[PDB]
Design a protein around this ligand. Sequence first.
Ligand SMILES: *[C@@H]1O[C@@H](C)[C@@H](O)[C@@H](O)[C@@H]1O
Length: 46
Amino acid sequence: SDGDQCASSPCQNGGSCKDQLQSYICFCLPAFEGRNCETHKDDGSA
Ligand SMILES: *[C@@H]1O[C@@H](C)[C@@H](O)[C@@H](O)[C@@H]1O
């Protein structure tokens, strides 16, 4: 699977995705979580 696996915005919350070997990589901030930075670590009611 050597190619690009992030040509469809897999990560969110301003996640920095980068094309790497096999799969890709998303560099986010410590205040963000989720399988693809799609969740903000705000910790409110839920
Ligand atoms: C990509 O890296 C992450 C960690 C943030 O700094 C983004 O704003 C940047 O584009």
